[PDB]
Structures are given as C-alpha cells and as structure tokens.
Design a protein around this ligand. Structure first.
Ligand code: MG
Length: 221
C-alpha cells in the first residue's frame, strides 16, 4: 500500500524496455535474426551496469550484427518482442489517470516505437538509439548524439524531461542497475524482477516488484 501511495503520486513514469516492458533484450533478438545470437548475448551480459562503456559495447555488438533495414523490418514483422504480462493493463491505468508514460532504452527506436505502438505511447515519449542505413539498406552506424548512446543515458533522458515539462514526481521502473542509477535524477525507482531477477537490484532497491499486478493492486478496474 505504501508502494501504491508512491506510485499514485507520480505524474510521469519512465519504463526501461529490455527485460522490463518486453521479455527479451532487443539487441539480442536482432542478433538472433541476424545469426550472431551467442556472441552478442554474451557481450550484452558483459556490459551490464557500468561495467564497460556503453557506447563502445554498442558499437562492438552492432559491428558483429551489421543489421540491414530489411532484417530490422523482419524482426518487427515475424518475431516481434513479447510484452511482459501486465504491462498493457498498467500503462492503460496510468494513462487513464493522465500520468505521462515514457519508454527509455539502449535498444533501437525502430523496435521500441513498435512496442510503444502497442501500448498507445506516442513516439514523442520514446527515447532510444537510432540505427543508420545506407540507401540500399546496409548497416551504416548509429546516432551517437542520442543520450541513450552513452553510459548514464537514462538519467540524462530524465533530466531532459524534467527541464522540458517540469514534472513534479518522475518514477523510473526497470530491472537493472542502470535503471536504479537513474534515481537521481528520477524522484523514485521501482525495480522489476518479473522476467529475470537481478539480485543486486532486489537487494538494494527500496521498492521492488516481480509482477506488474502489484501496482494494479488498487481497486482493480
Ligand atoms: Mg533492462
């Protein structure tokens, strides 16, 4: 109930995407589509937390993947990421109370906009990395000016949102240490373990849930 009191005081909620809003890690699923799952999935685990600089870890994984525009399109069409149970209902209840909902990801806007356009979250509220392609569709790099291209990028996004909209109370929700480290500048953090529990987050977060229903413990409508 104290959790729900906190949750209901927020005027903006930012969700991590990989392993929070969706069950999978987008970059790993792209690597699967492109045939380099094993190497990239390992590098993704390697980059967890501030362990290695994020921009370098992103460049190296994409250098192995080399995703074409057609391959990104085929991922979205044939193997779309699975939404975590409860997230559709939770975003719906937040939007019905006019809480501004955002998605923040070190993954890619192509995929995250598809996810947002399952949750009625406008593309303006999506912050993610942007893949580049040549005219023929070949992988051409990524937008290195995005805040999500750098370590600490989630906190930079939240700072931008505070400066643009002056929200009173922004809550960050995510599964990983990089989400926990986005508070501050977020006003509170809720850790999420419904897909995989990151024990260091569970052990140190003030607020932690394993099923989005727990925030749907209000009046259930
Ligand atoms: Mg995550």
């Amino acid at each position: 109930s104290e959790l729900r009191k906190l949750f209901y005081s927020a005027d903006a909620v930012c969700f991590d995407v990989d392993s929070t809003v969706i069950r999978e890690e987008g970059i790993d699923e792209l690597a699967k589509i492109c045939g380099v799952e094993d190497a990239v999935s390992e590098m993704t685990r390697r980059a967890m937390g501030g362990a290695v600089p994020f921009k370098a870890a992103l460049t190296e994984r994409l250098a192995l993947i080399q995703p074409s525009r057609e391959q990104v399109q085929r991922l979205i069409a044939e193997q779309p990421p699975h939404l975590t149970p409860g997230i559709r209902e939770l975003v719906s209840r937040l939007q019905e109370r006019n809480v501004q909902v955002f998605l923040i990801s070190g993954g890619f806007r192509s995929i995250v906009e598809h996810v947002a356009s399952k949750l009625n979250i406008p593309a303006t509220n999506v912050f993610a990395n942007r893949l580049k392609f040549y005219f023929n569709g070949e992988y051409a790099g990524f937008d290195e000016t995005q805040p999500t291209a750098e370590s600490g990028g989630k906190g930079k996004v939240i700072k931008l949102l505070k400066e643009k909209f002056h929200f009173k109370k922004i809550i960050m929700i995510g599964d990983g240490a990089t989400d926990m480290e986005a508070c501050p500048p977020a006003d509170a953090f809720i850790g999420f373990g419904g897909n995989v529990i990151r024990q260091q987050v569970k052990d140190n977060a003030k607020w932690y849930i394993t099923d989005f229903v727990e925030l749907l413990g209000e009046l259930e409508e």
